[PDB]
Design an enzyme around this catalytic site. Structure first.
Site, PDB file in Angstrom:
ATOM      1  CB  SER A 188      -1.006  -0.018   1.142  1.00  0.00           C
ATOM      2  OG  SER A 188      -2.050  -0.938   0.827  1.00  0.00           O
ATOM      3  N   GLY A 189       0.389   2.229  -0.803  1.00  0.00           N
ATOM      4  CA  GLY A 189       1.069   3.492  -1.034  1.00  0.00           C
ATOM      5  C   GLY A 189       2.029   3.425  -2.212  1.00  0.00           C
TER       6      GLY A 189
HETATM    7  C1  LIG Z   1      -2.332  -2.358   1.068  1.00  0.00           C
HETATM    8  O1  LIG Z   1      -1.371  -2.642   1.746  1.00  0.00           O
HETATM    9  C2  LIG Z   1      -3.216  -3.366   0.421  1.00  0.00           C
HETATM   10  C3  LIG Z   1      -3.715  -3.176  -0.867  1.00  0.00           C
HETATM   11  C4  LIG Z   1      -4.452  -4.168  -1.492  1.00  0.00           C
HETATM   12  C5  LIG Z   1      -4.719  -5.370  -0.835  1.00  0.00           C
HETATM   13  N1  LIG Z   1      -5.523  -6.398  -1.391  1.00  0.00           N
HETATM   14  C6  LIG Z   1      -5.611  -6.678  -2.700  1.00  0.00           C
HETATM   15  N2  LIG Z   1      -4.874  -6.136  -3.673  1.00  0.00           N
HETATM   16  N3  LIG Z   1      -6.534  -7.578  -3.043  1.00  0.00           N
HETATM   17  C7  LIG Z   1      -4.236  -5.556   0.457  1.00  0.00           C
HETATM   18  C8  LIG Z   1      -3.498  -4.565   1.078  1.00  0.00           C
END
Ligand SMILES: *C(=O)c1ccc(NC(=N)N)cc1
Ligand SMILES: *[C@@H]1O[C@H](CO)[C@@H](O[C@@H]2O[C@H](CO)[C@@H](O)[C@H](O)[C@H]2NC(C)=O)[C@H](O)[C@H]1NC(C)=O
Length: 326
Positions: free
Chosen positions: A276-277
């Site tokens: 994420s980010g």
């Molecule tokens: C962030 O850390 C994050 C983004 C997206 C997901 N899940 C999927 N891409 N399904 C988990 C965590």
């Protein structure tokens, strides 16, 4: 009211549509002034006439010195680049990243451990997700950035770049994750080399394919409920059309215009906790563009539960204004 349009960075000025700027009497100094207006401060790369109504320069007394004209006597429009960006070498279901393959990738630390990913856009500005900097991590003192290092064990305490400023989008909604974008400014600028370089911000009119081929990279878990990856991983993902992503069997109308879906509906390849980010990038006109920032999803690499990313194109003018305001 000055913008860069499409993959060829065509300089455009707004009239109460948008028209391209004539190459007539234009020079690097006018280009520097245009870049400053866009918030690029001390950054400048190139200004050249591309053969693609127009705004012509008034050779009397940057925006206020332009008038509407039917033709460019130079028979060319301005192509303006404010920074050398989008150049590189030559996560579940991915592969170890090579050195210099994703040089805009950063690891953002709190209490000496990876928390989130980020994307270098200038020597001092990093794009990340607003959910990464929610309370109690809203204050910049908590954060340090690591660039050009593939491995978490090679990210030593005291060697990271201290973050000096944190700015979350004013419309970020923590319940729905709408407008999930934040900026971080570093206390000391980065030194660009073959391992550390910025990715280009997306221009309006990229005209991406409905299922454009993209890449994601990060230190996120390599399986659902897994631990942070010690190594940087990267994977190819395709954009998923929003109408398809919003269907009853996928995310049932939760995808707004400020979000983009990417991955595979069969699952197996996806972003995960700790990615994420981070970046969602594509290659077009031989340039790497920042299309998205890793935002959310239900689980990781599950069928009919793909990755959801902030639509960076929607946020580019908000980014320009924050960089200018600083
Ligand atoms: C962030 O850390 C994050 C983004 C997206 C997901 N899940 C999927 N891409 N399904 C988990 C965590
Ligand atoms: C180029 O710039 C000049 C100077 O700013 C413009 O002339 C002015 O036009 C306004 C009306 O819009 C007059 O009130 C001023 O008196 C003019 N200034 C001078 C010094 O004469 C001129 O219009 C511009 N050229 C074009 C083609 O737009």
């Amino acid at each position: 009211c000055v913008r860069l349009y499409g993959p060829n960075f065509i300089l455009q000025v707004y009239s109460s549509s948008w028209h391209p700027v004539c190459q007539d009497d234009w020079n690097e100094n006018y280009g520097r002034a245009a870049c400053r207006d866009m918030g690029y401060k001390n950054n400048f790369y190139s200004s050249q006439g591309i053969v693609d109504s127009f705004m012509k320069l008034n050779t009397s007394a940057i925006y206020k010195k332009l008038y509407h004209s039917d033709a460019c006597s130079s028979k060319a429009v301005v192509s303006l680049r404010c920074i050398a960006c989008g150049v590189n070498l030559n996560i579940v279901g991915g592969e170890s990243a090579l050195p210099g393959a994703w040089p805009w990738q950063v690891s953002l630390h709190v209490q000496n451990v990876h928390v989130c990913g980020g994307s270098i856009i200038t020597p001092e500005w990093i794009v990340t997700a607003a959910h990464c900097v929610e309370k109690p991590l809203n204050n910049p003192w908590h954060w340090t950035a690591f660039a050009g290092i593939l491995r978490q064990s090679f990210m030593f305490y005291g060697a990271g770049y201290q973050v000096e400023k944190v700015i979350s989008h004013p419309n970020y909604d923590s319940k729905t994750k709408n407008n999930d974008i934040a900026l971080m400014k570093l206390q000391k600028p980065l030194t660009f080399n073959d391992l550390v370089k910025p990715v280009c911000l997306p221009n309006p009119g990229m005209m991406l394919q409905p299922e454009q081929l993209c890449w994601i990279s990060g230190w996120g878990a390599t399986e659902e409920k897994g631990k942070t990856s010690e190594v940087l991983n990267a994977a190819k993902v395709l954009l998923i059309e929003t109408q398809r992503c919003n269907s009853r069997y996928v995310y049932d109308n939760l995808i707004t215009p400020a979000m983009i879906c990417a991955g595979f509906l069969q699952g197996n390849v996806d972003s995960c906790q700790g990615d994420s980010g981070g970046p969602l990038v594509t290659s077009k006109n031989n340039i790497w563009w920042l299309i998205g920032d890793t935002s959310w999803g239900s689980g990781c690499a599950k069928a009919y539960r793909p990755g959801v990313y902030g639509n960076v194109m929607v946020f580019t003018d908000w980014i320009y204004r924050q960089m200018r305001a600083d």
